Amino acid sequence: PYASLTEIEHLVQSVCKSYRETCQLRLEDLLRQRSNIFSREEVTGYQRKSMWEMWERCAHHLTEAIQYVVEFAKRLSGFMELCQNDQIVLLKAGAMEVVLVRMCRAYNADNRTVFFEGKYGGMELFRALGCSELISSIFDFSHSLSALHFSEDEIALYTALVLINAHRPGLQEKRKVEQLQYNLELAFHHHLCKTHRQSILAKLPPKGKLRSLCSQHVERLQIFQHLHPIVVQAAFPPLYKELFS
Amino acid sequence: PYASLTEIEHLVQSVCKSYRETCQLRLEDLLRQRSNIFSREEVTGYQRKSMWEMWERCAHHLTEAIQYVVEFAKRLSGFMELCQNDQIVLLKAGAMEVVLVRMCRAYNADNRTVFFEGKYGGMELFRALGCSELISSIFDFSHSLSALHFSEDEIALYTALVLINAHRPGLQEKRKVEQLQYNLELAFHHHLCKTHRQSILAKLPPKGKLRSLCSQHVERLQIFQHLHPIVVQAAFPPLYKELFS
Amino acid sequence: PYASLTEIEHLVQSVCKSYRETCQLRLEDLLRQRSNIFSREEVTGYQRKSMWEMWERCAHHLTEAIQYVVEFAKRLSGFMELCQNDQIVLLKAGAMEVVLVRMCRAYNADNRTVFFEGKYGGMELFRALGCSELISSIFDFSHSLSALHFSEDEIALYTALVLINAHRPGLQEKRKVEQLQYNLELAFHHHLCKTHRQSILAKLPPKGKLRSLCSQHVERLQIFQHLHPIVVQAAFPPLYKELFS
Amino acid sequence: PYASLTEIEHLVQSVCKSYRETCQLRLEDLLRQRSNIFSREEVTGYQRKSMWEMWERCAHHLTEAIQYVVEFAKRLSGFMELCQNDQIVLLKAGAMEVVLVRMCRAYNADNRTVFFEGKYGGMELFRALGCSELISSIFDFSHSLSALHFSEDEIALYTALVLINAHRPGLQEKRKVEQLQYNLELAFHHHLCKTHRQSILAKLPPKGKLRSLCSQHVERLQIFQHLHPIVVQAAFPPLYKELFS
Amino acid sequence: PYASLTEIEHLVQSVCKSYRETCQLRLEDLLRQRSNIFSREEVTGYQRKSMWEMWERCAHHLTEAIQYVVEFAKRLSGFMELCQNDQIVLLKAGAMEVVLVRMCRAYNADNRTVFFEGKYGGMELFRALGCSELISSIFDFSHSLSALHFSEDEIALYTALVLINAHRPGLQEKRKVEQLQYNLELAFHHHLCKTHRQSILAKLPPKGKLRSLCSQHVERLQIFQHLHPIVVQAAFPPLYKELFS
Amino acid sequence: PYASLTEIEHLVQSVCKSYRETCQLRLEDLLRQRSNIFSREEVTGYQRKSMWEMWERCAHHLTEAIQYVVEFAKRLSGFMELCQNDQIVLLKAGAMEVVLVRMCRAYNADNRTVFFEGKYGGMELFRALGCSELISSIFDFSHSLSALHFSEDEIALYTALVLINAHRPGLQEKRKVEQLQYNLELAFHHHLCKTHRQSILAKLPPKGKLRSLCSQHVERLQIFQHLHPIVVQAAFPPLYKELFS
Amino acid sequence: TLLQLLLGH
Amino acid sequence: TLLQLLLGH
Amino acid sequence: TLLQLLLGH
Amino acid sequence: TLLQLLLGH
Amino acid sequence: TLLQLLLGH
Amino acid sequence: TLLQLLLGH
Numbered sequence A, B, C, D, E, F: 001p002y003a004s005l006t007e008i009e010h011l012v013q014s015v016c017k018s019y020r021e022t023c024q025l026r027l028e029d030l031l032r033q034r035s036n037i038f039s040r041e042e043v044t045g046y047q048r049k050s051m052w053e054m055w056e057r058c059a060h061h062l063t064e065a066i067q068y069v070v071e072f073a074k075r076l077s078g079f080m081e082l083c084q085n086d087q088i089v090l091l092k093a094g095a096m097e098v099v100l101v102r103m104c105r106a107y108n109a110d111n112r113t114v115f116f117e118g119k120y121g122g123m124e125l126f127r128a129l130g131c132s133e134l135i136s137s138i139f140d141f142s143h144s145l146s147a148l149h150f151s152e153d154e155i156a157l158y159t160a161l162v163l164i165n166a167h168r169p170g171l172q173e174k175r176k177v178e179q180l181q182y183n184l185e186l187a188f189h190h191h192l193c194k195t196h197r198q199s200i201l202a203k204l205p206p207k208g209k210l211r212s213l214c215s216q217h218v219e220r221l222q223i224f225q226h227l228h229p230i231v232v233q234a235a236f237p238p239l240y241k242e243l244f245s
Numbered sequence G, H, I, J, K, L: 001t002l003l004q005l006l007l008g009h
């Protein structure tokens, strides 16, 4: 060792804490409600809702989580110390990525159900969206993640790396991000070895898997932003509009 | 691992700190005075004191320690978060148990002497109590504990588990205690393995050993509370009276 | 284990932090400027300066670092708790020792250059001092240290032990220092084993090596304090004068 | 530490090896055939077999495994060094216990199927036995074990402790077994902490759970040994007859 | 953990031993001769040798090392258990790769010299080869490796993975290699975390870097095999001819 | 790490095994007989024996142990690989040193008794020797060692270092011993950190403490070799005579 | 109640 | 800007 | 006895 | 005294 | 074949 | 020599 161990196991604690505070839903509560499923009747009610409702509905629920991700970023060690521009670039292109990762906690894999609006629901509540291929791609993603059996610490560190990405275009102080990214990579790897969990590094999904999903989302949005342009202009939360233009 | 290591080694630190602050006597001071013994003359002075003095005397010294145990409880992680009722039930039935454990620090096993009123004294200062069998049972208990050579961290974690006991009757939110107890069990076990001290888990005295002692105490009290009812009503500290009715 | 692990790995963190805050120059900045060398012209400018300038110059730069060492001491765990006299004795005889150790961070060993006044310079900037043997002895010392490839944590703990020395004469509460020194020795050794860096304990330079250097410095000073007595009286920083009389 | 670490992590290796050699079926082969199930037709064929066939059939398959358990015992460190009598007592009362533990490797919990005669079959192949309550009790047992996700090392060490039991009646050199049992307990516990798997110690099934099953087996046998006494006398393998009289 | 730790830290020992026995030159001997350099006169003697000598010379020295690599393979755990065809495919395409890795031990990076024919020589002994670009590419490769400061254990495990590559074309039982490769990947990664050396995994050179070098070698050979076809047919060692056709 | 961990934890095992095989008395047997003391009558019988008997007696018992130490040396890793001369020098000057260390296992510190001729006896069985100051010095030495609570592994490694000493005069291949000594120092230190027993390194007795004892022995021998020269010539075992001339 | 006071009930 | 507001730009 | 045989008694 | 000042004596 | 010989094919 | 014998010199 040449790097300060005290400094790196400080970062591990800092990241895990910043996530712990901005974890939105506490896990024990997310788990105990896994026996709280949408009835066959309730599900039908969702899929016979209108596309411009299910979009407006989800776009609010999404922006709900995204807000917490922003808080995570702010409390993240050495994130604010970055340039104001870079600070935006990472959050804008990365916030949606983080949420998709966080979903695996609200996703039970035994029944392939996500915790949506109070209860667990299947892939087909979101039938009314018209982008039911992207939904399947999302559920498949959260399945692979749920298969890895992440700890809450590993979620904390993984999502941290998801946000801090120097390979994101538009970065002014790129070299500044590279350094921060590396220390977080070191911290993640150290914690995995501290816990014999090094095996999952290869099991992690490719960097392009979330590149696909997040862009596939903004693709189906531009469709909706054209079908119901006045709806997204008047109803959709501004933060959502700002991020997904 | 699936549980958050950062969360569990946080608890280990939290418990050890809460004890460290409410340790009453600091250990180095408790040790250096082990060459400070009651003379043969002094001892006789104690055993020719009156039963209603030696009881009133000890009942104050006991309530002195018990007060510190209450502080330990308050500073204990997630103790206050429990129900107000349960909070009382655990403390009432458990405070006396903790003190008996803490005594092993003020008990030198080479000479079988306890640190009482400034100096180390034998089993027979407490001859004047009339319950000289319970005293022997107590000294034997603290001997077995002293034989294990606890660390101050292990005392901190052991006593924590002694207090947090979901097997105590009268608990409203019992399931709440079970969860807290388990995390403390995990934290204790983790720290023992971190220090190769796992061996002592089997060496620990049974849960009923302290059930015996604490009840054996309140048994001999009811005798005294009947022999000298007016003494305990007027002299004995209220907190003692409240706990041992 | 019998000592509290939580207490000892707390000290390790406390020491590393107190150094981290009083590290004067941050290391990454000290490293990136290793390609910033004094030109052949610049060097000549230094060695044709007057002895009473190069002494007055360095004596200010030295007192600059020494001030930071004093801050390190104040923030050092359990240093202030020592006697006021002892507090002075350790700092006075030890501050110069610490600085010599800290120099190895500002010393590149590939070219044998020290970071002096904005750039890296060789052994011969200090030719104008007249004590060019002591300078060589110093550079040789920082070379051996640089050869060990210290971590920033190991610097933090080593320098801590350098300051806390119960073998220093003039100590009132010597036994008090011995105890503090030991806990720091334990903490250092624990951290080295935590990091497989135990090998360096034998590689460390003898306690007399710095005894030589620091006294060899005050020896060449008394020469200068006699050659230019009015210069040191009027120009040399008071803290320097106080420490090296 | 006071016990020889080298000696205890030698035992851990010795036990794991002795099991590895007598593991009967290699695990990777046991796993890849989990997609090899008995058809609805095949199952019916089993349950319409005669009780005296299904008993004679299983009693041979059981004695097949029991033979491997005996080899495990012989290769087990310090088992042969025990008294010849004790050597028999442990094996006789314990061999059946070990097999029940080993079954959890041939038991898939997703479908509640055991690997029987080339394919995986449900609880109801053994309907023809007449003791279909014991079968359910067995499948429930192997489910709880399968829920713990044992390593092959943990199986090796657990089964070792199952066999080495000083609480078994009829032991001559009981104190000799106690000592061997303890070293194996230490070795097991050490390996669990080496792998952060200490959590499972409390998750392990009670000592009486297998006391129930093994005796429940010999109970239903005495029924069959009375219904078809001539069958068990002529067909049942001698080793089976010897162990279950 | 679910994989057998005892099994994986057995493999780590097995690989390190198989290398230790087939390490050709022992390291301490390779190091002490680093002050044994070719004189300016000697070097000229090498570069004025004929191309058909320097090729015939090196092709023998290369086949010398390659023979040891074959022994390493044979003693490698679970290599012989592979198919006879696959056994050849891995060795043929991989032996040259391993040697290039092993060279970093006979390469001093302070002076950029390789241990050739008794002494250390620079990049320009091999001027007479005509492929002096490949030589530079090789020296650059061994420099990067020498920069990582491998342990002898890490060389043992790295080279093992270099040989065991399921991405090599012509493999019959490819799935068999994938499994062996993975266990070796796990073993390597485990040992790196055991030694806090996980950092080097990212520092390792790409899989194509050696693909370049080994093919770049066989490319310049076909040139020589055409310029001096009768030389390679009569002088070049058969094993070399067999591998590089 | 740069040294091969696999190589160093191999040495740790090799040394511990070589001692384990040549441990003379097994420890559990040495401990259980601690309640087997010489009666007041028996002791008197020893001290009224003649000086030339008690010397001849002990000189045989000593040579008994020394023979085992020689076996330890032979089985010690890389001891035989040393020069034949050096091999003798280390054994001759070091065998007596090792035995004095091994005595701490046969020395109970609660009663200050050594296991001599079947039972535990005090310092005063050896009154008849006339060198009753050396005896006291020896008992004091084994007390300090017994105070450290060595493991059997730590005895194995300590005694190894006691024998392998390059500071012994008369060494031909001294540099060869230095290298072997260092690897053993590394192995010892590694094992202590593996077991959190690093604390004892400073607690170990100085190298001169055994220099004193062993020479103090040969000093009192020359007295006896002059008082009863014909006794030592005819009775004393040749190996003893050879070592202590 | 005194115990309740010591806590804050 | 809303994102800028959430941070403090 | 068969069990005794399997061991070596 | 300056050193005493820097500490707080 | 020489490589086959070195192994044992 | 006896010591030499014990080793093998």
Ligand SMILES: CC(C)=CCC[C@@H](C)[C@H]1CC[C@H]2C3=C(CC[C@]12C)[C@@]1(C)CC[C@H](O)[C@@](C)(C(=O)O)[C@@H]1CC3
Pocket: A023, A024, A025, A055, A058, A059, A061, A062, A064, A065, A099, A100, A102, A103, A106, A114, A115, A116, A117, A126, A129, A135, A138, A217
């Ligand atoms: C067009 C669009 C937006 C399609 C996406 C539709 C779907 C996939 C999308 C719309 C709503 C959104 C959602 C989550 C992520 C994906 C999902 C379900 C999760 C589960 C992530 C974790 C948060 O903690 C938690 C629980 C919360 O907000 O509390 C939410 C609950 C709501």
Ligand SMILES: CC(C)=CCC[C@@H](C)[C@H]1CC[C@H]2C3=C(CC[C@]12C)[C@@]1(C)CC[C@H](O)[C@@](C)(C(=O)O)[C@@H]1CC3
Pocket: B023, B024, B025, B055, B058, B059, B061, B062, B064, B065, B099, B100, B102, B103, B106, B114, B115, B116, B117, B126, B129, B135, B138, B217
């Ligand atoms: C009828 C009764 C009450 C019988 C009990 C009599 C005896 C056993 C009982 C009466 C007084 C009591 C006592 C302690 C526990 C048992 C004991 C001695 C200890 C040592 C625990 C640790 C505290 O830190 C410390 C040092 C303190 O108060 O500072 C006390 C000192 C006084």
Ligand SMILES: CC(C)=CCC[C@@H](C)[C@H]1CC[C@H]2C3=C(CC[C@]12C)[C@@]1(C)CC[C@H](O)[C@@](C)(C(=O)O)[C@@H]1CC3
Pocket: C023, C024, C025, C055, C058, C059, C061, C062, C064, C065, C099, C100, C102, C103, C106, C114, C115, C116, C117, C126, C129, C135, C138, C217
């Ligand atoms: C007569 C005398 C005083 C002779 C000493 C002359 C020489 C050896 C001496 C005079 C000035 C002094 C010096 C340092 C230590 C030795 C040295 C160079 C270092 C490098 C230590 C680390 C500090 O962080 C740093 C960078 C700083 O002040 O920022 C300084 C920079 C200035």
Ligand SMILES: CC(C)=CCC[C@@H](C)[C@H]1CC[C@H]2C3=C(CC[C@]12C)[C@@]1(C)CC[C@H](O)[C@@](C)(C(=O)O)[C@@H]1CC3
Pocket: D023, D024, D025, D055, D058, D059, D061, D062, D064, D065, D099, D100, D102, D103, D106, D114, D115, D116, D117, D126, D129, D135, D138, D217
């Ligand atoms: C009356 C009786 C005997 C009732 C018991 C009936 C049932 C429960 C019982 C009869 C046959 C028996 C059996 C096993 C244990 C329980 C079970 C199924 C297992 C799976 C243990 C692991 C061995 O490795 C393996 C695979 C083998 O023999 O290879 C066997 C396969 C056959």
Ligand SMILES: CC(C)=CCC[C@@H](C)[C@H]1CC[C@H]2C3=C(CC[C@]12C)[C@@]1(C)CC[C@H](O)[C@@](C)(C(=O)O)[C@@H]1CC3
Pocket: E023, E024, E025, E055, E058, E059, E061, E062, E064, E065, E099, E100, E102, E103, E106, E114, E115, E116, E117, E126, E129, E135, E138, E217
């Ligand atoms: C056309 C060709 C073959 C060009 C390659 C020329 C050059 C690069 C090539 C020709 C000879 C060859 C060589 C080695 C690898 C590369 C190198 C130098 C090393 C150093 C590897 C480690 C072995 O342990 C050791 C020491 C040995 O054989 O003992 C050899 C010594 C000889």
Ligand SMILES: CC(C)=CCC[C@@H](C)[C@H]1CC[C@H]2C3=C(CC[C@]12C)[C@@]1(C)CC[C@H](O)[C@@](C)(C(=O)O)[C@@H]1CC3
Pocket: F023, F024, F025, F055, F058, F059, F061, F062, F064, F065, F099, F100, F102, F103, F106, F114, F115, F116, F117, F126, F129, F135, F138, F217
């Ligand atoms: C003049 C002389 C020789 C004075 C020495 C007298 C005394 C100190 C000396 C004479 C006999 C000798 C002795 C031992 C070391 C010191 C001691 C007692 C020990 C205990 C070491 C460990 C061996 O395992 C063990 C048990 C054995 O031989 O089995 C012996 C038993 C006999």
